Structures are given as structure tokens and as C-alpha cells.
């Protein structure tokens, strides 16, 4: 069992925080917010670094390039923006979605960005040019999450339509549609680190690990509350192998991936924990909460 303990509370976003992510080089945490801003913080000391501004409406997601130099952000202003972190410059504004952009991610080579939108589409963008390369007719309801696999050859998407879909990056073809009894809205999805599984959150207070190729649910994680928000989930791999998620009861939940038992609940946020992130090399977790709290917390364990 881990022993995550609070180390720092990071404050100053003026509205709900939407997403927190650690830079791949482990040096930084980036946060996005309904306040239309991105903030950068020291990953190990929680020290505020800088604010990055330019979106015209709130931002629901942010993601780092593999070399930790760029960010992409997804906004209700219907665009994504690519940012040079050290200069703060907006390098490109990605236009094409017809509604809120909700989620985003770079591929491992970082030459592509994938986005999902309330317009029900998934779009694949060229980083260098800013051009949309493909528009996938992915879902029949808002797209809640998009993620590339370890070698970038696949994209997984999730939707309120109750489905998770696997896409061939090169062709745009849908290679798989995952179906689960009752088709509860899917609020989050991501590949496992080895790319063999996908972790999916549904708005019925449940997280599941799936062997998507075979359409077999291998694990189910419950105990938390998730019925209204798209809460991030994660695979913790620097120490023990955990599943980490936020929750609508203001707690961070940690489960043993194999046993499915809850091994820790982290307390002291005062609103829904919308986002959690796991450091790439240290046993550190970042968490972020909604409007009534607006703080980010950094927790650290010995294992």
C-alpha cells in the first residue's frame, strides 16, 4: 500500500481547474482552468512558474509534447492552441471543430495532435503546420477523451454515446468498437502503458480495464463517485502498480490494479477532484478540484 501524503497546495487559478499534467521530463506540472488560463508549476516544489494566456473561453484539457517543450490546450472557444512553453508564445491555433474542444493529446513522436470535441468528431492535426489532417466521424455524442498508444499507431476515443473506439492513426479507420452492457456514458479512456489495454471510466461510478482487442473486461474498480464529470484516471507505475482517479466526493482514490482493492483515499480537497496525474519517475501525484476549491495538490509516497 502506498503512503501518499500532502506536500504542497498550489493556488491562484480564479476558477475551477480542469486538467493537470506532468511534463515528460518530470520537471513541471501544467494546469488548465475555466479561467481561460494555463499555469506552470514546479513538479517537485510546487512553485508557481508562469501563466500562459490567449484562449477566449475556458480550457478543458492540456497536454505536453514528448520533449516537454510544447503544450496543446483544448478550449470552449472551439480551438486548440499549441504553445512554446519557455517563451509563452502561441505557435498555432487549430481551427475546425464546430463546438467545444474537450480533450487533447500529442502522439509520442509529437508530430501529431488528436482532439475530441462536443461536435462528436475526433480530429488529427499536423503540429508543424497546424493543419487538420483528418476528421473522424467518431461518435454520436460528445467525445470525452482521446489518447494515442505507445507507438502512435492507434487512437482510442470515448463518448457519452456509450462507446469506446479504436482508430488506425494512418488510415482513419475504426478498428474496434467496445460495447458494455447498458452503454453507460463513457467519461474517460486511455491506453495502458503497454498499449494492450484501455482503462475506461463510465458515469455509473465505475472504472474498467479492458483487453479491447478481445472485448474482455479484465478488471473493475469501484468505491468512488463518478456520475456527472469527465474525471481523469491513471496508471501509476513508478512504485506499486496502482489505478489513480479523482472522485465527486472530493477524494483521490488509489486502487491496486490487480486486486482491485482500494489502497488509499487522499483527503483535503473541498470540491470534486476532476483531474489526477502521476509523475513519470517519482511517486508523486497531482490532483485538482473544481470551482469551490480551485486548488491543485501534490502528494508524495515512499512507494
Amino acid at each position: 500500500k502506498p503512503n501518499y501524503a500532502l506536500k504542497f497546495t498550489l493556488a491562484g487559478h480564479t476558477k475551477a481547474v480542469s486538467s493537470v499534467k506532468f511534463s515528460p521530463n518530470g520537471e513541471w506540472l501544467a494546469s488548465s482552468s475555466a479561467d481561460k488560463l494555463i499555469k506552470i508549476w514546479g513538479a517537485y516544489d510546487g512553485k508557481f512558474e508562469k501563466t500562459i494566456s490567449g484562449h477566449k473561453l475556458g480550457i478543458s484539457d492540456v497536454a505536453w509534447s514528448s520533449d516537454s517543450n510544447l503544450l496543446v490546450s483544448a478550449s470552449d472557444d472551439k480551438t486548440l492552441k499549441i504553445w512554446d512553453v519557455s517563451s509563452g508564445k502561441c505557435l498555432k491555433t487549430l481551427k475546425g471543430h464546430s463546438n467545444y474542444v474537450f480533450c487533447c493529446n500529442f502522439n509520442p513522436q509529437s508530430n501529431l495532435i488528436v482532439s475530441g470535441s462536443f461536435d462528436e468528431s475526433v480530429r488529427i492535426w499536423d503540429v508543424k503546420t497546424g493543419k487538420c489532417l483528418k476528421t473522424l466521424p467518431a461518435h454520436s455524442d460528445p467525445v470525452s477523451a482521446v489518447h494515442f498508444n505507445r507507438d502512435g499507431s492507434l487512437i482510442v476515443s470515448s463518448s457519452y454515446d456509450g462507446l469506446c473506439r479504436i482508430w488506425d492513426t494512418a488510415s482513419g479507420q475504426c478498428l474496434k468498437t467496445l460495447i458494455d452492457d447498458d452503454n453507460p456514458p463513457v467519461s474517460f479512456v486511455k491506453f495502458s502503458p503497454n498499449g494492450k489495454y484501455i482503462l475506461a471510466a463510465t458515469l455509473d461510478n465505475t472504472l474498467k480495464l479492458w483487453d479491447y482487442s478481445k472485448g474482455k473486461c479484465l478488471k473493475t474498480y469501484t468505491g468512488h463517485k463518478n456520475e456527472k464529470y469527465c474525471i481523469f484516471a491513471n496508471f501509476s507505475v513508478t512504485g506499486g502498480k496502482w489505478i489513480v482517479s479523482g472522485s465527486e466526493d472530493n477524494l483521490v482514490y488509489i486502487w491496486n490494479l490487480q486486486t482491485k482493492e482500494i489502497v488509499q483515499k487522499l483527503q483535503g480537497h473541498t470540491d470534486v477532484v476532476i483531474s489526477t496525474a502521476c509523475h513519470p519517475t517519482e511517486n508523486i501525484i497531482a490532483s485538482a478540484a473544481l470551482e469551490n476549491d480551485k486548488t491543485i495538490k501534490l502528494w508524495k509516497s515512499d512507494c
Binding site: A16, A34, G58, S60, D76, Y160, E227, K228, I274
Partner: peptide, 10 residues
């Protein structure tokens, strides 16, 4: 916004 809730189905 992700920060705003989806009314659960009735």
C-alpha cells in the same frame, strides 16, 4: 467546460 456537470440521465 469539463468543469461543468452533465446532468445525469433521469
Amino acid at each position: 467546460m469539463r468543469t461543468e456537470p452533465r446532468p445525469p440521465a433521469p
